[PDB]
Amino acid sequence: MVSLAQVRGALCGALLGDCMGAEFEGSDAVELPDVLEFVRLLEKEKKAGTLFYTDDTAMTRAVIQSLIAKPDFDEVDMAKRFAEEYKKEPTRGYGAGVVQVFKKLLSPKYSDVFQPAREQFDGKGSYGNGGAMRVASIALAYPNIQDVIKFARRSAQLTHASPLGYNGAILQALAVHFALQGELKRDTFLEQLIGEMERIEGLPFCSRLKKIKEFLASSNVPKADIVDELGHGIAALESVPTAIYSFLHCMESDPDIPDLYNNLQRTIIYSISLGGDTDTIATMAGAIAGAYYGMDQVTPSWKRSCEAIVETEESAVKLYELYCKQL
Ligand SMILES: O=c1[nH]cnc2c1ncn2[C@@H]1O[C@H](COP(=O)(O)OP(=O)(O)OC[C@H]2O[C@H](O)[C@H](O)[C@@H]2O)[C@@H](O)[C@H]1O
Ligand SMILES: [Mg+2]
Ligand SMILES: [Mg+2]
């Protein structure tokens, strides 16, 4: 049985990764030293709430409010909350494409809430990581893996109609789902994910999960190799496996990151140090780590720095009660 500490951990880990990663997003200059300096400064900051969240968290909050309002899952309700959140705070950092989905949903013209997403990119759909950046809460609300898969897919398909986009969301939901199942050994965790994605894809995501297995079996893998083989990009394929790798890697000491940081801290630091799409890779890695290690590794000095931490903690309690009702 999942603990309150795990649901809280996942949501706070997602918030921290977004808030902390946001400062570096789209840098091909961010290096580990920058991130370590940022963290030391952040811990000494006298004012609370100095880091604002981005679209990653804005959409997360909308997903959560939809699940609480309509716990059997209502994609029409969720689409409306996404569109209305966009309209209310359009500057949070959304992808250039997905804005058009929100505009179409806000218009009177579409009865099918999935149709705007299908029309994206000449009808091929978005392959971006926006479906995955917000999907953790599906795994926190629905214990049954079949529900996690079908609702991750549908939640993603409101904006991301490409199989790369919505399979990336499924993968991220499954990573959170398997992280909730306890002391899970690295090898078991990957076997669980590969098992599910082979069925779902069959294989681009499986191929990357296989590379992850190879990397974890090596030592001192340079950042360059991770970036080159897994990616650090806005495409789901180039970010969701990378977030999973970050989590798995950070289950053990990293030679470049001081051991005074706990595993969840290490995970967020490491994620951000890979550069590229840093808010999204760290929000995804942070969700997984939070689910795994729980709220005991979300420290007071870190969490107080984030916009909407109190609202986030309150929403975790509500999600936990939905999870418990689903049992
Ligand atoms: O099919 C495609 N063809 C061509 N380009 C594609 C395609 N799918 C995604 N993209 C690219 O991926 C981008 C993002 O996808 P989309 O517009 O659907 O938004 P999405 O929400 O996927 O972007 C999420 C990212 O946005 C913020 O950075 C946020 O923090 C996160 O990193 C698009 O603007 C395109 O550059
Ligand atoms: Mg963002
Ligand atoms: Mg991002």
State which residues form the domain around 325: 1-327
Cβ atoms within 10 Å of 187's Cβ, excluding its own: 12
Q: Which residue has the tokens 């689903």?
A: 326
Q: Is 296 exposed, middle or buried (0-12, 13-18, 19+ CB in 10 A)?
A: exposed
Q: How many domains does the chain have?
A: 1
Cα 148 to ligand 1 centre (Å): 23
User: What is the best residue among 24, 126, 272 to mutate for testing ligand 1's pocket, by most ligand atoms within 8 Å of CB?
Assistant: 126
CA 194 to mean position of chain CA atoms? 19
Q: What is the CATH number of the domain that holds 324?
A: 1.10.4080.10
Resolution (A): 1.8
161 lines ligand 1 (CB under 6 A): no
CB of 73 sitting under 6 A from ligand 1: no
**Angstrom distance (rounded) from CA 252 to CA 244:** 14
Q: How many CA atoms lie less than 13 Å away from 62 in the CB half-sphere?
A: 27
Q: Is 17 in the pocket of ligand 1 (CB under 6 A)?
A: no
Q: Is 27 helix (H, G, I), strand (E, B) or coil?
A: strand
Residues whose CB is less than 8 angstroms from the CB of residue 306 and which lie 6 or more positions away in sequence, other chains included: 15, 16, 19, 49, 51, 53, 312
The reply to whether 299 sits in an annotated binding site is: no
CA separation for the pair 250, 262 (Å, rounded): 9
Written as one string, the DSSP assignment of 272-300 is HHT-BSHHHHHHHHHHHHHHHH-GGGS-H
DSSP states of 71-105 as a string? Answer: TT--HHHHHHHHHHHHHH-TTS---TTHHHHHHHH
